[PDB]
Amino acid sequence: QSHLDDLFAYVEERCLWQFFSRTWDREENIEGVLNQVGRLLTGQEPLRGTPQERLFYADALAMANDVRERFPWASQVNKEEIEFLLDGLKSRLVDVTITRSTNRELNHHLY
Amino acid sequence: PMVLLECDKDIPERQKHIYLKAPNEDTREFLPIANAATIPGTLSERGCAFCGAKLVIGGVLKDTIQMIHGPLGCAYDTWHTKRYPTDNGHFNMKYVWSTDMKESHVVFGGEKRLEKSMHEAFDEMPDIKRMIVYTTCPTALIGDDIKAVAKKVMKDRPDVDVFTVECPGFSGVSQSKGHHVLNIGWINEKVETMEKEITSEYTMNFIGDFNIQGDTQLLQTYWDRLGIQVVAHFTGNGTYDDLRCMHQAQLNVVNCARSSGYIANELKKRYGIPRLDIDSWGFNYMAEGIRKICAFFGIEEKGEELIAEEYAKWKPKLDWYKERLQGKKMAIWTGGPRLWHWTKSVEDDLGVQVVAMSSKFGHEEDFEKVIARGKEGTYYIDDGNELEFFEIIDLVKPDVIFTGPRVGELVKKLHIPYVNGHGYHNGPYMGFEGFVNLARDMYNAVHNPLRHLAAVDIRDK
Amino acid sequence: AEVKLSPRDREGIINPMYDCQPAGAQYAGIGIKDCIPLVHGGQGCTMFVRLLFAQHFKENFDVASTSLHEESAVFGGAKRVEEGVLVLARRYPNLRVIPIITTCSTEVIGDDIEGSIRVCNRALEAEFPDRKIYLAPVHTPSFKGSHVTGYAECVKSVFKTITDAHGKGQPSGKLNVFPGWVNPGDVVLLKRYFKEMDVEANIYMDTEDFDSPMLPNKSIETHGRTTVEDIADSANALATLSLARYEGNTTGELLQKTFAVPNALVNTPYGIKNTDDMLRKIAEVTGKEIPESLVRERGIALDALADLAHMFFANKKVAIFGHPDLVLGLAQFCMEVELEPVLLLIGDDQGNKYKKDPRIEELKNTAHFDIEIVHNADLWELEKRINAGLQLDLIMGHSKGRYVAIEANIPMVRVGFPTFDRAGLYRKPSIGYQGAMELGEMIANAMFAHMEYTRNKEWILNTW
Ligand code: CLF
Ligand SMILES: [Mg+2]
Ligand SMILES: [Mg+2]
Ligand SMILES: [S]
Ligand SMILES: [Zn+2]
């Protein structure tokens, strides 16, 4: 299994942020958390300027720590690979939690 | 694949509610329909919308009259049935209030009967200054305007504050609608109607925890150690007026995203308060939650000290239970969220394999979560009914079932022990210590001489 | 001695004594073999009552809902009833009886239950030509009466339905017995008394097997034992013995009117005199003698009670709450053993009946002290009287009053329904001679423990 398979399987089994109540919140979280994961895994400073950024950092830090613990490759891998991988992971999470989810509430404007 | 159980051959519409996860499937093709109408006559486990408002959320509050506008049964039925202690002598469990609707009220209206009952309740208990009024089936049907009545009482009694909920039992399909109506009404009417002193640089609400057997009070030991002020608990060991101040918090930490995600989502939209979803059951999950909370606030090292202390205190006992529970098969037949909070945590921390799960009222979102975290070969059931439970037992042969007491008492006849997945056996079950308590009860349930004795027929040589 | 009746002075209720009518109709139905009640209304009306039964008995009982939702609440629920009947029959091949129990919601919206039964009968005769399913309309609006009245209504409707279908035939030689709303242990006792007297009887409903075993073969035996055939045979009885004015006597009256089965209503058999009088009436109607074994059980009870009455019970003030037959009967028992039942609370709107109960005059002629009987009472009325200074030595009532006694530090004996906060009470008789003995010993043991915990002459429990 590929590196991207390992990331996807980890997110699906562990994380909750991709399963928020509505499409817009899932989109916001998939983008926000994974951008922070990419900073963390390539040794860049995370964004911590706004409350929302600081939440994305909190969720991303767990993920980044767990992937470095679980997967040998995740230490001993590139930068341009985090980019490739996170682009793929975003697309895969949007596909399974949004595009092809049959959860009928996802586009309800009203909470 | 989806499963048509034998007992459902005459209600074949149930197939779309039951998923058996199999290898290589794209689970997006197999998500159970959830939160749909109940089939009459099935012995579904479901309850009503009023339950979701009064019993589950509003009634947890320590300092509030729970005025049920309806005939007396709805009140009787929601009294002596919950285990949510408080630190004020359990006022919330000791009392229930009814407007004792009679036929004349059905015919000519119940608004004056409600007004009088409200005054009475305030007069009887002059130290109590807060109330929630709930509609029930017949007071909804006749169109009583409980908001109007509450506004008049408030004008006549400037010492009180009253909130109203329209939640007849036939609304929605289950208790879920009661959660929704209460959440949305509270944020629209009562949030931002008061403020409290802020005493910490770190503030949060804790959203969707109802203090079952003291869960909230146990978690509070963590927040106090970390120096985090909880502006409001929604609603475990809570007060009415704390809930009025929820807009003040820096962070909303959510456990029960089913009952209480609504208000977290509206607090984010209206006030910008971020929503953090955690798991406050599970040992390793509890650590992850504390680490996320501490990362948000910039107090990582404090969180690590707490976690290290709690691991040293409780991890050895957890591991003792793991050695003994490894491989045991569990079913979880509860409301919904505990399926996705527990399937992987009991697997990770206790070695226990959850073989069947049923959700009374969960939404498709709850099924997304549980199937993501759950095992292959497990049954995932939306709106399960009694005969299905028997068939599932035959299929998966659980060693222990986490469910309510009445179902526990049923499966005892089949020699299957239970733990009360709702109100607990010997809780609390949240947090580090709480998962040990869960494990202990599971162990005692299964490691039980009575089960073996019951199988012996003394007439056999 | 003045016995004063008064109503609750509040419109609202705080801490209701009883549940609503549908709950009692469910209790009546679960005592019938091959019966699953169908409660027409919202889901809570079913599920909360299944929980209540699990609290009292620590068992599951099968009751189904029609699952009224918003559509049906606006446009009518007849299709929910009709579907629910069919779903039941399809999935439970051995089902024979379905009391269709109305709720506040379906009474307000005016669903026509009898019409839905015609529809269902046609559908069931077509789909299941070899089965017979009895559908009984049970009208139980919750905005009248209480679970006491709903139990009585459900028994009456099920008996009307089944006996309408079968009519009168061969005399059976048996008594019909309506004990009312009692525990399995009470039914066990009555069965023993009829057996020792050589009197054949059906007890309606026969709930003995609610206390079901955990068996090697994993079978489930938690069912009512009263069958269709038993119920039908009530038209053929020698006589009806009705023990409870408010919990089945109206069925005995219906069988008298319809089938000329003479009904004998007696005082509910709590205490010695009431049990004597029940056995006298049994002897009179059957021509059978009371056996020596019952004189002996009586004597054993009296011996036990005599060890307690003047020593521990005399002059002690008691409050009693529960079903009206139980409250009135326990007050009579209490006076036999020198207790003083000064406050009796009865929990529903039936005060015009209770004022005419002959036991009120019986209590007036035997009381050495004033009695207050509060009708339409809630349990706040008890708590508020204690808060105002009423000094009680004992409370007798069901478990939903427990916090009143715990907080006031008053010993309390658990009687009536539900008794969830002690173990095994459903198996212990309260009626009859054995039951009087068992009640008296529970009272003494509760006082004894209280003397210990409070250090109140705890040294005296040595040579009594
Ligand atoms: S579904 Fe829920 S519990 Fe049911 S009535 Fe409706 S709000 Fe209430 Fe109430 S008084 Fe009794 S229990 Fe019912 S029949 Fe009415
Ligand atoms: Mg996976
Ligand atoms: Mg003796
Ligand atoms: S529910
Ligand atoms: Zn052992």
TrEMBL record, chain A:
**EC identifiers of the protein:** 1.18.6.1
User: What Pfam families does UniProt report for this protein, alphabetically?
Assistant: AnfG_VnfG
Determine if Iron-sulfur is one of this entry's keywords: yes
A GO MF term: nitrogenase activity
Q: What class of enzyme is it?
A: oxidoreductase
Asked if the Swiss-Prot or TrEMBL record annotates the protein with the keyword Iron, the reply is yes
Identify the cofactor(s).
iron-sulfur cluster
* Keyword set, alphabetical order: ATP-binding, Iron, Iron-sulfur, Metal-binding, Nitrogen fixation, Nucleotide-binding, Oxidoreductase
Q: What is the superkingdom listed in this entry's lineage?
A: Bacteria
Catalyses which reaction(s): N2 + 8 reduced [2Fe-2S]-[ferredoxin] + 16 ATP + 16 H2O = H2 + 8 oxidized [2Fe-2S]-[ferredoxin] + 2 NH4(+) + 16 ADP + 16 phosphate + 6 H(+)
Subunit details: Hexamer of two alpha, two beta, and two delta chains.
Q: What does this protein do?
A: The key enzymatic reactions in nitrogen fixation are catalyzed by the nitrogenase complex, which has 2 components: the iron protein (component 2) and a component 1 which is either a molybdenum-iron protein, a vanadium-iron, or an iron-iron protein.
What protein name applies here?
A: nitrogenase
Organism expressing this protein natively:
Azotobacter vinelandii (strain DJ / ATCC BAA-1303)
The gene name on file is vnfG
UniProtKB/TrEMBL annotation, chain B:
Keyword rRNA-binding (UniProt): no
Identify its protein family: Belongs to the NifD/NifK/NifE/NifN family.
Q: What's its catalytic activity?
A: N2 + 8 reduced [2Fe-2S]-[ferredoxin] + 16 ATP + 16 H2O = H2 + 8 oxidized [2Fe-2S]-[ferredoxin] + 2 NH4(+) + 16 ADP + 16 phosphate + 6 H(+)
Which gene is annotated as encoding this protein in its UniProt record?
A: vnfD
Return the NCBIfam families for the record.
alt_nitrog_alph (TIGR01284), N2-ase-Ialpha (TIGR01862), VNFD (TIGR01860)
Keywords in alphabetical order:
ATP-binding, Iron, Iron-sulfur, Metal-binding, Nitrogen fixation, Nucleotide-binding, Oxidoreductase, Zinc
Q: Cross-referenced SUPFAM superfamilies, in alphabetical order?
A: Helical backbone' metal receptor
**Which PROSITE patterns does the entry mention?**
NITROGENASE_1_1, NITROGENASE_1_2
Designated name of the protein: Nitrogenase protein alpha chain
Which species?
Azotobacter vinelandii (strain DJ / ATCC BAA-1303)
Give the EC number.
Answer: 1.18.6.1
Automatic annotation (TrEMBL), chain C:
GO CC, sorted alphabetically, is: vanadium-iron nitrogenase complex
Q: Which CDD domains match?
A: Nitrogenase_VFe_beta_like
* Record-listed Mg(2+) binding positions: E59, D303
* UniProtKB keywords: Metal-binding, Nitrogen fixation, Zinc
Indicate whether Oxidoreductase appears among the record's keywords.
Answer: no
State the Pfam families in the record.
Oxidored_nitro
> What sequence ranges are listed for the domain Nitrogenase/oxidoreductase component?
20-447
InterPro entries (alphabetical): ChlB/BchB/BchZ, Nase/OxRdtase_comp1, Nase_comp1_CS, Nase_VnfK
What does the entry list as the binding residues for Zn(2+)?
H368
Q: Which GO terms describe its molecular function?
A: iron-sulfur cluster binding; metal ion binding; nitrogenase activity
Q: Which family does it belong to?
A: Belongs to the NifD/NifK/NifE/NifN family.
| Name of the protein in its database record | Vanadium nitrogenase beta subunit, vnfK
